[PDB]
Nucleic acid binder design. Structure first.
Ligand SMILES: [K+]
Ligand SMILES: [K+]
Ligand SMILES: [K+]
Ligand SMILES: [K+]
Ligand SMILES: [K+]
Ligand SMILES: [K+]
Ligand SMILES: [K+]
Ligand SMILES: [K+]
Ligand SMILES: [K+]
Ligand SMILES: [K+]
Ligand SMILES: [K+]
Ligand SMILES: [K+]
Ligand SMILES: [K+]
Ligand SMILES: [K+]
Ligand SMILES: [K+]
Ligand SMILES: [K+]
Ligand SMILES: [K+]
Ligand SMILES: [K+]
Ligand SMILES: [K+]
Ligand SMILES: [K+]
Ligand SMILES: [K+]
Ligand SMILES: [K+]
Ligand SMILES: [K+]
Ligand SMILES: [K+]
Ligand SMILES: [K+]
Ligand SMILES: [K+]
Ligand SMILES: [K+]
Ligand SMILES: [K+]
Ligand SMILES: [K+]
Ligand SMILES: [K+]
Ligand SMILES: [K+]
Ligand SMILES: [K+]
Ligand SMILES: [K+]
Ligand SMILES: [K+]
Ligand SMILES: [K+]
Ligand SMILES: [K+]
Ligand SMILES: [K+]
Ligand SMILES: [K+]
Ligand SMILES: [K+]
Ligand SMILES: [K+]
Ligand SMILES: [K+]
Ligand SMILES: [K+]
Ligand SMILES: [Mg+2]
Ligand SMILES: [Mg+2]
Ligand SMILES: [Mg+2]
Ligand SMILES: [Mg+2]
Ligand SMILES: [Mg+2]
Ligand SMILES: [Mg+2]
Ligand SMILES: [Mg+2]
Ligand SMILES: [Mg+2]
Ligand SMILES: [Mg+2]
Ligand SMILES: [Mg+2]
Ligand SMILES: [Mg+2]
Ligand SMILES: [Mg+2]
Ligand SMILES: [Mg+2]
Ligand SMILES: [Mg+2]
Ligand SMILES: [Mg+2]
Ligand SMILES: [Mg+2]
Ligand SMILES: [Mg+2]
Ligand SMILES: [Mg+2]
Ligand SMILES: [Mg+2]
Ligand SMILES: [Mg+2]
Ligand SMILES: [Mg+2]
Ligand SMILES: [Mg+2]
Ligand SMILES: [Mg+2]
Ligand SMILES: [Mg+2]
Ligand SMILES: [Mg+2]
Ligand SMILES: [Mg+2]
Ligand SMILES: [Mg+2]
Ligand SMILES: [Mg+2]
Ligand SMILES: [Mg+2]
Ligand SMILES: [Mg+2]
Ligand SMILES: [Mg+2]
Ligand SMILES: [Mg+2]
Ligand SMILES: [Mg+2]
Ligand SMILES: [Mg+2]
Ligand SMILES: [Mg+2]
Ligand SMILES: [Mg+2]
Ligand SMILES: [Mg+2]
Ligand SMILES: [Mg+2]
Ligand SMILES: [Mg+2]
Ligand SMILES: [Mg+2]
Ligand SMILES: [Mg+2]
Ligand SMILES: [Mg+2]
Ligand SMILES: [Mg+2]
Ligand SMILES: [Mg+2]
Ligand SMILES: [Mg+2]
Ligand SMILES: [Mg+2]
Ligand SMILES: [Mg+2]
Ligand SMILES: [Mg+2]
Ligand SMILES: [Mg+2]
Ligand SMILES: [Mg+2]
Ligand SMILES: [Mg+2]
Ligand SMILES: [Mg+2]
Ligand SMILES: [Mg+2]
Ligand SMILES: [Mg+2]
Ligand SMILES: [Mg+2]
Ligand SMILES: [Mg+2]
Ligand SMILES: [Mg+2]
Ligand SMILES: [Mg+2]
Ligand SMILES: [Mg+2]
Ligand SMILES: [Mg+2]
Ligand SMILES: [Mg+2]
Ligand SMILES: [Mg+2]
Ligand SMILES: [Mg+2]
Ligand SMILES: [Mg+2]
Ligand SMILES: [Mg+2]
Ligand SMILES: [Mg+2]
Ligand SMILES: [Mg+2]
Ligand SMILES: [Mg+2]
Ligand SMILES: [Mg+2]
Ligand SMILES: [Mg+2]
Ligand SMILES: [Mg+2]
Ligand SMILES: [Mg+2]
Ligand SMILES: [Mg+2]
Ligand SMILES: [Mg+2]
Ligand SMILES: [Mg+2]
Ligand SMILES: [Mg+2]
Ligand SMILES: [Mg+2]
Ligand SMILES: [Mg+2]
Ligand SMILES: [Mg+2]
Ligand SMILES: [Mg+2]
Ligand SMILES: [Mg+2]
Ligand SMILES: [Mg+2]
Ligand SMILES: [Mg+2]
Ligand SMILES: [Mg+2]
Ligand SMILES: [Mg+2]
Ligand SMILES: [Mg+2]
Ligand SMILES: [Mg+2]
Ligand SMILES: [Mg+2]
Ligand SMILES: [Mg+2]
Ligand SMILES: [Mg+2]
Ligand SMILES: [Mg+2]
Ligand SMILES: [Mg+2]
Ligand SMILES: [Mg+2]
Ligand SMILES: [Mg+2]
Ligand SMILES: [Mg+2]
Ligand SMILES: [Mg+2]
Ligand SMILES: [Mg+2]
Ligand SMILES: [Mg+2]
Ligand SMILES: [Mg+2]
Ligand SMILES: [Mg+2]
Ligand SMILES: [Mg+2]
Ligand SMILES: [Mg+2]
Ligand SMILES: [Mg+2]
Ligand SMILES: [Mg+2]
Ligand SMILES: [Mg+2]
Ligand SMILES: [Mg+2]
Ligand SMILES: [Mg+2]
Ligand SMILES: [Mg+2]
Ligand SMILES: [Mg+2]
Ligand SMILES: [Mg+2]
Ligand SMILES: [Mg+2]
Ligand SMILES: [Mg+2]
Ligand SMILES: [Mg+2]
Ligand SMILES: [Mg+2]
Ligand SMILES: [Mg+2]
Ligand SMILES: [Mg+2]
Ligand SMILES: [Mg+2]
Ligand SMILES: [Mg+2]
Ligand SMILES: [Mg+2]
Ligand SMILES: [Mg+2]
Ligand SMILES: [Mg+2]
Ligand SMILES: [Mg+2]
Ligand SMILES: [Mg+2]
Ligand SMILES: [Mg+2]
Ligand SMILES: [Mg+2]
Ligand SMILES: [Mg+2]
Ligand SMILES: [Mg+2]
Ligand SMILES: [Mg+2]
Ligand SMILES: [Mg+2]
Ligand SMILES: [Mg+2]
Ligand SMILES: [Mg+2]
Ligand SMILES: [Mg+2]
Lengths: 272, 48
RNA sequence: CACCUCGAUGUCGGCUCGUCGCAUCCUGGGGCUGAAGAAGGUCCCAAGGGUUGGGCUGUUCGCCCAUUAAAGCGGCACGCG
RNA sequence: UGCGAAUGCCGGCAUGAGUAACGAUAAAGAGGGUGAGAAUCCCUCUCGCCGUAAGCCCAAGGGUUCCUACGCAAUGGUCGUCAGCGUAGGGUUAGGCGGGACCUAAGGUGAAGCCGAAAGGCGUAGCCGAAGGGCAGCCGGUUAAUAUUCCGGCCCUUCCCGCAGGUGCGAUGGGGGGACGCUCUAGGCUAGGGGGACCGGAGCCAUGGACGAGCCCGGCCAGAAGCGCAGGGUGGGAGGUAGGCAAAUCCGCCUCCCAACAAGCUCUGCGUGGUGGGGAAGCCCGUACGGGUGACAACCCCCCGAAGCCAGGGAGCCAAGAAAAGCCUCUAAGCACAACCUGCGGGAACCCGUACCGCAAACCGACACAGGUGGGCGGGUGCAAGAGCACUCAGGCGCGCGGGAGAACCCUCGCCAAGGAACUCUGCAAGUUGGCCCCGUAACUUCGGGAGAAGGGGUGCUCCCUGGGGUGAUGAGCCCCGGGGAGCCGCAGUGAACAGGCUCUGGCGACUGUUUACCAAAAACACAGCUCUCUGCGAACUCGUAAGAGGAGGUAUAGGGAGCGACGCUUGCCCGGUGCCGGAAGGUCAAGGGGAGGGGUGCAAGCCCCGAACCGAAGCCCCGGUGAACGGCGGCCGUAACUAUAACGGUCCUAAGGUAGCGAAAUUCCUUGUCGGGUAAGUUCCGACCUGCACGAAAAGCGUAACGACCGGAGCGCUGUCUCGGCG
RNA sequence: GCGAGCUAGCCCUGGCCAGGGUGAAGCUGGGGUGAGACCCAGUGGAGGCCCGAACCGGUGGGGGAUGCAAACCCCUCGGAU
RNA sequence: GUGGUUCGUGGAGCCAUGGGGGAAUCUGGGCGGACCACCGCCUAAGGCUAAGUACUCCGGGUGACCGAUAGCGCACCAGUA
RNA sequence: GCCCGGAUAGCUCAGUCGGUAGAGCAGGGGAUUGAAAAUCCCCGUGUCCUUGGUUCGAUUCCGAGUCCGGGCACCA
RNA sequence: AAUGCGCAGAUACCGGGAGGAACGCCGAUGGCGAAGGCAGCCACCUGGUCCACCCGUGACGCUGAGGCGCGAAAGCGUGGGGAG
């Protein structure tokens, strides 16, 4: 489901907004929000280090739980599903039985009411977090730790999902949303299922303004500049690239690979 | 039109003020030079 | 060609204003004619005055339309910012 | 150590010259006064201008410009007796207004800690930091000049110390709260405004009429408790308890109960309200201006009504909307002859600002500069509405040179016989059209548009009839939206002012946007969207020597880089060269390893030099791949039963020889190509043809509704652009 | 070494946008059907929607050119949730 | 791998030292310009040490130094207006 | 107007160290066929563009000329 | 035959793994459906049809322009997938 509009204005022809049906709560859990400093892409020198960033709606950080073992075997009821302006996915507010409320990244399928729990115990059911080694092969799973106790860092974007392909000693074989096959330690936790809000990828921004609301300032092609600014700058009219296509900093940008070859993690990767 | 001097009494002392100079080594040298030359005022005249 | 001007002599056309030349487009005078008349042809005298309005192109020019006695050619820093 | 030159330097004085100017075309005239001196100062009258301002109040800036008295050398674009100028004197009063003895924001700083040749850079806590949060004063009078500051009336807040009554009290710690978007919006009020036949008031009867429910002026403001009338906030109990980094009886969670669109508690707003003030015109006062009287002033009724208040109100939406303290609660140590809470009394309540200008002669612009400067108020009538326009109240102003005159010429403006784009690069400019209501409206279209398309008709006033609302009561009054019929006047009824000219047809760009501050606003940039590529997270990338930071408190539906640029239909062949990608072999290759063998000296033992194989990375070579990677995408001769042409053949070269579609095009040199169309006449324009000097598919190709202060062509309407000028 | 008191971007916190038009979704009702899609009304009040002041601009033209002005003035024009 | 020295890789020692390796205590070590041999000179990897040397904000004494456009930017209430 | 390249069998073209020049197609003669093609066997003509010159000797080397092709004609 | 693959270790053979599509034998000239069509196996939801019985209704029938629904392959849109 995704909302379309009649063309009562241009750019409304193609505009497309998400379907907010699975949303249950509007204002968030007051005890679970922090303010987030908006950078505008500037570092701690006052300099831009990521271009074309800034403006866009004020946002409130929802402090969310990517380590699920700190409540082993305590279960919780799924209280709400709410909009989170800080990720593509939607978050689920869950009430633990001991009274703690936490934000979880809400898997596909999960809806208000069901029990959820983390731990080596845990039935294999959407929402439950478990160490990988006890998650049966061929289970789709998200919010995956990359190293034990360092927090979930894998598959957390809307409709993403990893899948367990096999086991090797302390490690297990994962296929990531990027199709790469990597070994991950068995002790790494993972809530089972896929992320959901899976239609994120079909919203059609529609107009320039909509890009601004997400804090994306306009983005100017090197071809449009002068040689002082860009490797593609200058010429007379238009001009093709005239050289291997490059970034403002002059490195090749079609095919040229950048992963550090000597990286220690090379030992645990096997795909593309 | 809108000219280049837009006075602001906070700005002035925040920018060229005595305590402003004294933090940067460059600015302590401004005072050093201004005294050695014998300026009547090392820092711009301001009014809180 | 490179003589004045590079401590600067604003460069095309149009508009306004003209003025001069005559190697005369018209009008005036004439010779010859393969000049019957009428209309021409070509050469001579003659610079007083006249020498249209529009389409196209920045155009000068040129080509068209409609007329005309005729729709002259040149020069004046390719006259005149 | 000798000056005539250096567009030499400093200074002085000429020329232009009694010349241009005297700074908005809002505008002046007269009378009286003053003074040596008056167009220019004071005063009266008349006239004009602003009035969503050119009036009034905040804030920033400025810093005595404020008030008074005495001055006029200079400053004042003239004059000056005047001044924002000279001299002197005076003037700014706060527990409640602003800010500090309160809070935190970005950011700064910064114990701990990390980094850096030095200087220094980073940095969790903490601290600093405000037009945000918190917090108790309204109204009149008074001064030459301050006033929510003094005075008066009424009312509050905090600290300290006492009583009295309560209660396990008690933090910098736990929890609640503070606390939050945009658009639309209900009800009830308040500000503000209009009317009144009613209440009050000096007075007036003019010039033809009018002694009338005549004209003119005014009919309020602040206000504790208690009371109403609106609204907002909030469930009440008992058990369990592993969470809120100790403890909580508090919060969270669970289970019971009662309560439930309320109530009851609170809390704000509004009204009333003790009391306290104000209180016009006009007239007389001598003020530059205030006073007296009007007066024992009256102080009421109705209507309109916020955008403001009740306010954390309600609905919808997606882009998802600060923090911290005060405040409440909870418990920890500690203490409970403490402490806190609740009332009531007495005491105590500091620092700084406070004048004046403040859309401008006091600020920013070298100037008393036609420029620039944020928030609030901003009345009345009419115009459909309105902060629009015309007039006008309160208020403020006539712009610090004047007097004449009545040429050319210039600027700004009005009109123009006949013609109507003939003007010119171009309808440049100006005209025309202009509001509201109603009738009506094509191609095409992405079905929304195109549309205000086009094109018309109506519009004033008078009398009669008459339907709804809102408020009152269902009734009158007062408003609001109207509907029907008769008639009046003019050239003309949106009678002034504000207020689209319209159509057809191409190019380009999809679109709203953006840009060369100050000669370019565009077909340029951006843009949603498409593709390629990188990147597994201590990500890639960027800044930094580093620490560190951004990326991102994100995680492949994510992030970086590149090109293309809605959408529709599509995007062909070439990997030889270059780039990127993949190749655990081979060749080459640096340090290093390794030392066959040579050498210098020594009597030697030695010491010390070179040094061949061979082992040696990345890179290059080599082998592959790769086109939304850099890029490329042919020639000549022949041939069909009329000619012409060539579907067909021959052959050279290449990595391969340009597919669809478009084509004298923003590309066509020859060129004003040739043909058709428009015109009387068309180097432009539109349609075609193909010989494409020198189109062609993401430096995209061909189209496309809608959009455009873009650029081209045509026409209608209308005009001083023109014939061709004239008058003012 | 001094500069973001002009200007460009971003960050924090506040403020502003008269008045008119148009009339998306969603409701609700009616039709429709086996059930729907859908159709019609009324309500509703969306939009880098329309007209137009403030406000932000700077299209064409005229003036100005030792200017009122080292970028101004007048008419006109664009945007204006 | 570099710096210093007249020494720019040169036959390149000496002094210093970022990296690696890594001793000896007099029969020990360093040096006399690659190296070896002889012959000599010194005693590293700890430290202190007046004077003779440099400068002129300041005080004095002198001038084939200036004399108000000179002389310090300033003879004067100048690092001021 | 200024430079570079080419011209060889009837067509499209290789080539040369200075001496005897070839390829493919076309064409000719034979074969196969009922008869044409396609196929098989056999066959070059070349004054290597003109002209001058170097040579013993020149298609070959040189200098000009005709012709063609390509690139150029910029600030102005 | 050649392109192609192969000492950079191929084919052929063993073991591990990933992935997609189609379901041998049964299988038939057989079955079902209105047609297009339907094939491994398991479960759920569901349509038609046949028979037995002679119980119920009582002509409620047949056909069917328009309308509505289904409709092999290829093809088109948005996403996914991609072994042959
Ligand atoms: K771009
Ligand atoms: K360019
Ligand atoms: K010259
Ligand atoms: K003549
Ligand atoms: K000129
Ligand atoms: K001189
Ligand atoms: K003079
Ligand atoms: K004076
Ligand atoms: K002046
Ligand atoms: K504050
Ligand atoms: K507390
Ligand atoms: K009250
Ligand atoms: K005051
Ligand atoms: K006015
Ligand atoms: K005169
Ligand atoms: K003409
Ligand atoms: K009534
Ligand atoms: K209009
Ligand atoms: K296009
Ligand atoms: K524009
Ligand atoms: K641009
Ligand atoms: K972050
Ligand atoms: K290639
Ligand atoms: K290749
Ligand atoms: K290649
Ligand atoms: K060696
Ligand atoms: K053509
Ligand atoms: K072309
Ligand atoms: K014709
Ligand atoms: K014609
Ligand atoms: K435009
Ligand atoms: K609206
Ligand atoms: K040396
Ligand atoms: K040594
Ligand atoms: K020595
Ligand atoms: K020695
Ligand atoms: K010493
Ligand atoms: K002097
Ligand atoms: K001096
Ligand atoms: K060849
Ligand atoms: K041959
Ligand atoms: K494939
Ligand atoms: Mg909080
Ligand atoms: Mg450019
Ligand atoms: Mg730059
Ligand atoms: Mg470059
Ligand atoms: Mg380039
Ligand atoms: Mg350029
Ligand atoms: Mg180009
Ligand atoms: Mg990748
Ligand atoms: Mg200045
Ligand atoms: Mg002093
Ligand atoms: Mg000369
Ligand atoms: Mg001269
Ligand atoms: Mg003559
Ligand atoms: Mg003449
Ligand atoms: Mg003449
Ligand atoms: Mg023309
Ligand atoms: Mg003519
Ligand atoms: Mg000439
Ligand atoms: Mg000449
Ligand atoms: Mg000329
Ligand atoms: Mg002189
Ligand atoms: Mg002097
Ligand atoms: Mg003097
Ligand atoms: Mg003169
Ligand atoms: Mg004169
Ligand atoms: Mg004059
Ligand atoms: Mg004046
Ligand atoms: Mg007088
Ligand atoms: Mg007077
Ligand atoms: Mg004023
Ligand atoms: Mg000042
Ligand atoms: Mg005064
Ligand atoms: Mg006086
Ligand atoms: Mg004077
Ligand atoms: Mg005054
Ligand atoms: Mg004074
Ligand atoms: Mg104190
Ligand atoms: Mg710091
Ligand atoms: Mg603080
Ligand atoms: Mg405040
Ligand atoms: Mg007062
Ligand atoms: Mg005052
Ligand atoms: Mg007062
Ligand atoms: Mg307590
Ligand atoms: Mg009131
Ligand atoms: Mg009232
Ligand atoms: Mg009113
Ligand atoms: Mg009386
Ligand atoms: Mg009378
Ligand atoms: Mg009476
Ligand atoms: Mg009476
Ligand atoms: Mg009142
Ligand atoms: Mg409860
Ligand atoms: Mg506890
Ligand atoms: Mg209530
Ligand atoms: Mg009250
Ligand atoms: Mg009295
Ligand atoms: Mg609300
Ligand atoms: Mg604090
Ligand atoms: Mg009290
Ligand atoms: Mg004041
Ligand atoms: Mg003033
Ligand atoms: Mg004033
Ligand atoms: Mg004032
Ligand atoms: Mg104002
Ligand atoms: Mg003033
Ligand atoms: Mg004023
Ligand atoms: Mg000024
Ligand atoms: Mg003035
Ligand atoms: Mg001014
Ligand atoms: Mg007003
Ligand atoms: Mg009105
Ligand atoms: Mg109106
Ligand atoms: Mg007005
Ligand atoms: Mg007045
Ligand atoms: Mg004015
Ligand atoms: Mg006329
Ligand atoms: Mg007329
Ligand atoms: Mg006409
Ligand atoms: Mg014309
Ligand atoms: Mg015009
Ligand atoms: Mg007009
Ligand atoms: Mg049509
Ligand atoms: Mg329509
Ligand atoms: Mg329509
Ligand atoms: Mg009338
Ligand atoms: Mg109008
Ligand atoms: Mg064209
Ligand atoms: Mg555009
Ligand atoms: Mg628009
Ligand atoms: Mg510009
Ligand atoms: Mg601008
Ligand atoms: Mg301009
Ligand atoms: Mg412009
Ligand atoms: Mg980080
Ligand atoms: Mg582009
Ligand atoms: Mg060795
Ligand atoms: Mg290698
Ligand atoms: Mg290769
Ligand atoms: Mg392509
Ligand atoms: Mg192109
Ligand atoms: Mg391309
Ligand atoms: Mg394009
Ligand atoms: Mg096109
Ligand atoms: Mg089009
Ligand atoms: Mg635009
Ligand atoms: Mg005229
Ligand atoms: Mg005149
Ligand atoms: Mg700034
Ligand atoms: Mg700034
Ligand atoms: Mg708009
Ligand atoms: Mg508008
Ligand atoms: Mg408009
Ligand atoms: Mg306003
Ligand atoms: Mg502005
Ligand atoms: Mg302009
Ligand atoms: Mg406007
Ligand atoms: Mg050296
Ligand atoms: Mg050397
Ligand atoms: Mg020696
Ligand atoms: Mg002397
Ligand atoms: Mg001097
Ligand atoms: Mg002096
Ligand atoms: Mg030939
Ligand atoms: Mg010869
Ligand atoms: Mg069945
Ligand atoms: Mg029977
Ligand atoms: Mg089908
Ligand atoms: Mg298919
Ligand atoms: Mg296709
Ligand atoms: Mg498909
Ligand atoms: Mg696909």
């Amino acid at each position: 489901a995704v909302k379309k509009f009649k063309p009562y204005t241009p750019s409304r022809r193609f505009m497309t907004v998400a379907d907010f049906s699975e949303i249950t709560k509007t204002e968030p859990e007051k005890s679970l929000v922090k303010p987030l400093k908006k950078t505008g892409g500037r570092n701690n020198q006052g300099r831009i280090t990521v271009r074309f960033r800034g403006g866009g709606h004020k946002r409130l950080y929802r402090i969310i739980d990517f380590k699920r073992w700190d409540k082993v075997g305590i279960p919780a009821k799924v209280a709400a599903i709410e909009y989170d302006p800080n990720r593509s996915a939607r978050i689920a507010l869950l009430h633990y039985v001991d009274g703690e409320k936490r934000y979880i990244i809400a898997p596909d399928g999960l809806q208000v009411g069901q029990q959820v729990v983390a731990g080596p115990d845990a039935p294999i059911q959407v929402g439950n977090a478990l160490p990988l080694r006890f998650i049966p092969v061929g289970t789709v799973v998200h919010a995956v730790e990359l190293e034990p106790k360092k927090g979930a860092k894998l598959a957390r974007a809307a409709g993403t999902s990893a899948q367990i392909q096999g086991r090797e000693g302390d490690y297990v074989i994962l296929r990531l949303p990027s199709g790469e096959l990597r070994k991950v330690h068995g002790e790494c936790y993972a809530t089972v299922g896929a992320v959901g809000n899976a239609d994120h990828k079909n919203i059609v921004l529609g107009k320039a303004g909509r890009s601004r609301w997400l804090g994306r300032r306009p983005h100017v092609r090197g071809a449009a500049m002068n040689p002082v600014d860009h490797p593609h700058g200058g010429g007379e009219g238009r001009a093709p690239r005239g050289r291997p296509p490059a970034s403002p900093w002059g490195w090749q940008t079609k095919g040229l690979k950048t992963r550090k070859r000597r990286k220690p993690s090379s030992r645990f990767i096997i795909a593309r | 039109m809108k000219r280049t001097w837009q006075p602001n009494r906070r700005k002035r002392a925040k920018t060229h003020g005595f305590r402003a100079r004294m933090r940067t080594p460059g600015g302590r040298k401004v005072l050093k030079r201004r005294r050695q030359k014998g300026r009547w005022r090392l820092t711009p005249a301001v009014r809180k």
